[PDB]
């Protein structure tokens, strides 16, 4: 499990590279290998908390700040391939997997990692004698991984944008009757005590409520048809754009209203 203590053990490690950088000593195999570790750590931590969102962000920052520095440092025998290949192989296991919107940040980070091994390895090549065939072969495998990955990541963000979009059409439309309906339901719930005659009485109460919202019976049928699948897709995870889980939870409340009123008759009559 990733604990906070582990996380700062790993952070002091990066800072070490950042200083060796500052003073022109950066072990480039060291820092790239170590970065791969950070990525799996941050990945594990992201998906069982145990760590507070304060650090997660500064850790992410600190990773990116290290990538930054590496890009700036590159401007100034198969050794690397040997060190850095494991990372490509692990990241290659993500491509064959199935992705949700909580995975976005993980993939953005992996992409940045391939971006970075590529820039670093082509730079060492463009100057350091002709490239071996093992390295040329790795380089191409890297480029294919980076472009497959960009393609999935773009699919994922493209899909999310359209969920955001769908979300706010449905939120906007609901509110023709959100108001009437919520309040109707509040009145119905507040008044409800078995025998024949108790059943007729509860029937009547429900019929009154159905009447109150009869201008939207139809709309509320159609809403849940549209909104239930969206909610299944968006699921219940804490890990997505904050505004998106906000809108998501707003839609769940709206949907539970309609679904109550769409059920009310078969439930009480």
């Amino acid at each position: 499990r990733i604990t906070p203590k582990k996380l700062r053990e790993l952070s002091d490690l990066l800072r070490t590279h950042l200083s060796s950088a500052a003073t022109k000593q950066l072990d480039m195999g060291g820092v790239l290998s170590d970065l791969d570790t950070m990525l799996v750590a941050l990945d594990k931590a992201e998906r069982e908390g145990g760590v507070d969102k304060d650090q997660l962000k500064s850790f992410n920052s600190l990773i990116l700040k290290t990538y930054r520095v590496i890009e700036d440092y590159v401007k100034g025998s198969n050794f690397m391939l040997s060190i850095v290949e494991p990372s490509l192989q692990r990241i290659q296991k993500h491509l064959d997997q199935t992705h949700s919107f909580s995975d976005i940040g993980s993939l953005v980070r992996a992409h940045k990692h391939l971006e970075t091994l590529l820039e670093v390895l082509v730079t060492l090549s463009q100057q350091g004698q002709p490239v071996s065939s093992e390295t040329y072969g790795f380089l191409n495998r890297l480029a294919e991984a980076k472009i497959t990955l960009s393609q999935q990541l773009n699919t994922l963000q493209q899909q999310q944008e359209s969920a955001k979009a769908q979300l706010s059409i449905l939120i906007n439309r609901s509110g023709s009757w959100a108001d009437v309906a919520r309040q109707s339901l509040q009145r119905f719930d507040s008044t409800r005590p078995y025998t024949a005659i108790h059943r007729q009485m509860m029937a009547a109460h429900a019929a009154i409520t159905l009447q109150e919202v009869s201008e939207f019976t139809d709309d509320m049928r159609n809403f849940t048809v549209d909104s239930i699948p969206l909610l299944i897709q968006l699921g219940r995870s804490s890990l997505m754009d904050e505004h998106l889980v906000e809108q998501r939870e707003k839609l769940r409340e709206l949907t539970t209203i309609a679904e109550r009123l769409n059920r009310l008759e078969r439930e009480w009559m």
């Binding site: 090549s125 490239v131 065939s133 040329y136 191409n140 480029a143 294919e144």
Partner: protein
């Protein structure tokens, strides 16, 4: 003990989807791939007998795209021979021989022999393919047309082949080798 043998480097270039990567696979495994076809073939070196003495043939595939444009140049150093491929059923791939591949190679490999390879020989007499092209005022490249392209770019030999049927395939690499032993 040990003995020397010739080791030759070979680099293949040409437009996307002209058949470069399949050429290499079909030649080196005798199997045209079903589905899945990497962008660039895994770097790979073949021992071929020629006139009774064996030769080590290093096959370097390429692509171009965007990452692949910073990558391709790194294949050129110490190249002994290079194949320029184009598809016989894609005149645009033919045009880029003069426009792109010939100049790029002569830049990076002055003095190295070039073979021109017209690819997809099997599709030239396929009426589906021919009709598709008729459907947009195109027709396959012919031999005298490719032969003249080869003459103009100073190619040492022009060769047609079909990775799918293996028809010209072994000849392409024998001539690539031969061109390096003068």
């Amino acid at each position: 003990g040990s003995k020397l043998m010739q080791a030759i480097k070979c680099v293949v270039v040409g437009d996307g989807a002209v058949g470069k990567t399949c050429l290499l696979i079909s030649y080196t495994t005798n199997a045209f791939p079903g589905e899945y076809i990497p962008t660039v073939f895994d770097n790979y070196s073949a021992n071929v007998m020629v006139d009774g003495k064996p030769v080590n043939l290093g096959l370097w595939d390429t692509a171009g795209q965007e990452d692949y444009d910073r990558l391709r140049p790194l294949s050129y150093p110490q190249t002994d021979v290079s194949l320029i491929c184009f598809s016989l059923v894609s005149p645009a791939s033919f045009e880029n021989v003069r426009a792109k591949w010939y100049p790029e190679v002569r830049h990076h490999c002055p003095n190295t022999p070039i073979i021109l390879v017209g690819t997809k020989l099997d599709l030239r007499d396929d009426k589906d393919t021919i009709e598709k092209l008729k459907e947009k005022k195109l027709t396959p490249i012919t031999y005298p047309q490719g032969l003249a392209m080869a003459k103009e770019i100073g190619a040492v030999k022009y060769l047609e082949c079909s990775a799918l049927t293996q028809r010209g395939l072994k000849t392409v690499f024998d001539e690539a080798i031969r061109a390096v032993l003068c």
